[PDB]
């Protein structure tokens, strides 16, 4: 007999026990939305409330329901380094790979750009994500990891991980540039050396 919004309010309040209380109601529609198009699951993913997120996924919450800026719980978890939640999603739900973020990207591109190497590994191992996918700018995960970032150890490691998993480094973005082009222009010596070792 809960009113619409009860579960959103419990998620906003980070109230794990209240969430579980509500979910005991078998009639409850778990994917109600707020003014920004967020479901309780999306709120939990933003907050990194892992137990709440697991509870909602077990009750059938849609990991692919996008909010007003095109972020679904899945896309956001991948992009923003919510590793535990992402691992759970990859085991207990089915990602929709025809849904993209506001820039036309997937979960893997932003995970790499943002340095979330554990998320990258997860998506490469059991994600289905195309390593060569491109966003609206023509950027791949490799290009973003090289060209948009600082070229440091973390990004060197992300570049190596991608190449070891068969990333195509010959892909050009919308400006006609490859990952090798960016590393060279920016003076990212260690990345250039890594890239030179692969075809």
Residue 93 burial (CB count, 10 A): 18
Interface residue with Cl ion among 14, 17, 60, 103 (CB under 5 A) is: 103
Residue closer to Cl ion by CB (options 135, 169) is: 135
Cβ at position 110, least distance to Cl ion in Å: 5
Cβ at position 96, least distance to Cl ion in Å: 16
Give the alpha-carbon dihedral of 181, 183, 184, 189, to 10 degrees. -150
Q: Which stretch binds Cl ion (CB under 5 A): 15-23, 38-46, 108-116, 176-184?
A: 108-116
Cβ at position 138, least distance to Cl ion in Å: 11
Cβ at position 144, least distance to Cl ion in Å: 7
Cβ at position 198, least distance to Cl ion in Å: 23
Rounded to whole angstroms, the Cα distance separating 98 from 41 reads 20
Cβ at position 105, least distance to Cl ion in Å: 2
Residue closer to Cl ion by CB (options 109, 191) is: 109
80 CB-side CA count, 13 A:
16
Interface residue with Cl ion among 135, 140, 178, 192 (CB under 5 A) is: 135
Tell me, what DSSP letter sits at residue 2? P
Question: Which of helix, strand or coil describes residue 135?
Answer: coil
Rounded to whole angstroms, the Cα distance separating 26 from 45 reads 23
Contact letters for Cl ion, residues 161-190 (x by CB under 5 A): ------------------------------
Contact 159, 133 (CB under 8 A): no
Tell me, what DSSP letter sits at residue 192? H
Q: Which stretch binds Cl ion (CB under 5 A): 45-53, 106-114, 171-179, 189-197?
A: 106-114
Total chain residues near Cl ion (CB under 5 A): 5
Cβ-proximal residue to Cl ion, closest one: 105
Q: What backbone phi and psi angles, to 5 degrees, belong to 65?
A: -80, 110
Rounded to whole angstroms, the Cα distance separating 18 from 12 reads 11
Residues at the interface with Cl ion (CB under 5 A): 103, 105, 109-110, 135
């Amino acid at each position: 007999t809960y009113e619409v919004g009860a579960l959103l309010e419990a998620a906003n309040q980070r109230d794990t026990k209240k969430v579980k209380e509500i979910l005991q109601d078998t009639t409850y529609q778990v994917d109600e939305v707020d003014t920004e198009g967020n479901t309780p699951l999306n709120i939990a993913v933003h907050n990194n409330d892992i137990e709440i997120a697991k509870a909602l996924i077990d009750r059938g919450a849609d990991i692919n329901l996008q909010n007003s800026i095109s972020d679904s719980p899945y896309l956001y978890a991948g992009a923003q380094g919510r590793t535990e939640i992402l691992a759970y999603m990859l085991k207990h739900a089915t990602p929709d790979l025809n849904k993209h973020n506001r820039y036309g990207g997937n979960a893997l591109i932003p995970a790499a750009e943002k340095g979330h190497i554990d998320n990258v590994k997860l998506l490469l191992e059991d994600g289905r994500e195309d390593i060569d996918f491109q966003n609206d700018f023509g950027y791949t995960a490799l290009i973003e990891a090289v060209g948009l970032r600082e070229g440091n150890q973390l990004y060197q490691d992300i570049v190596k991980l991608l190449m070891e998993n068969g990333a195509d480094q010959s892909i050009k973005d919308n400006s006609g540039r490859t990952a090798m082009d960016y590393a060279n222009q920016k003076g990212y010596t260690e990345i250039s050396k890594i890239l030179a070792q692969y075809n």
